[PDB]
Amino acid sequence: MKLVNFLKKLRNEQVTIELKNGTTVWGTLQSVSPQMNAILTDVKLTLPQPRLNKLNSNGIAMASLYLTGGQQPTASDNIASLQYINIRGNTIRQIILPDSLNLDSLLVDQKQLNSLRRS
Amino acid sequence: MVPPINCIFNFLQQQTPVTIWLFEQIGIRIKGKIVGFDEFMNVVIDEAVEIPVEKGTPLGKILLKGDNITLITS
């Protein structure tokens, strides 16, 4: 079994990939690779504010957010919108998938059934 | 030539006490006799002691994982 073969069927869905850095990426998903290289479209990648009376946020990710060339100058809070972001798999920590879709239709892997039906 | 897996084996049979420097993050050096090893350079240490970097407690018989092995030294 590969549970990455579950993600491949989750195509054209709204999703939030949430990265190792702490950068969340709200967008429309396209073809996920076998190594989990998720590739999105109409995206909005942001950093949350850890409040706690001005605790300094992720110093590396703020640089990488501005560098994408998506951060608009009058973005007061720390966000950056753009089209098309290709994301290397290993960086994914979580993927917050939406409420509407039913798991029971999608978690039935075809190669799982095709091993038992063949025997 | 003297391959390393060959030369790890010449601490097993010779019964020499070794010191093993770990990954710099953790902050301890382990020492004691290397009994036996696997293909993945993870070893069992007999009569082991945990020195922070000479007041550290004795461990006993410890299987050490091969991600954290930096040096193995006599």
């Binding site: - | 009994v35 090893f37 696997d38 993870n42 070893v43 461990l59 006993g60 018989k61 299987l63 994982k65």
Partner: protein, 68 residues
């Protein structure tokens, strides 16, 4: 003359401590079984970094050493 893979087989259902690399945290309980990759499973464990825990699974990467 004991190798590592047979060493885990000897330590089946005995009281072991397993040290994660992070905050000098040993998990103190009775081992259940082992994997090919030294994934672990515990019963009646105790977390020493104080608490008494139920039934634990530990992933392989995170472990430093295994003691009896």
């Amino acid at each position: 003359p004991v190798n590592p893979k047979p060493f885990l087989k000897g330590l089946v259902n005995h009281r072991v401590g397993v040290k994660l690399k992070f905050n000098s945290t040993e998990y103190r309980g009775t081992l259940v079984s082992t994997d090919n990759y030294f994934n672990l499973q515990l019963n009646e464990a105790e977390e020493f970094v104080h608490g008494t825990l139920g039934e634990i699974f530990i992933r392989c990467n995170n472990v430093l050493y295994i003691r009896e």
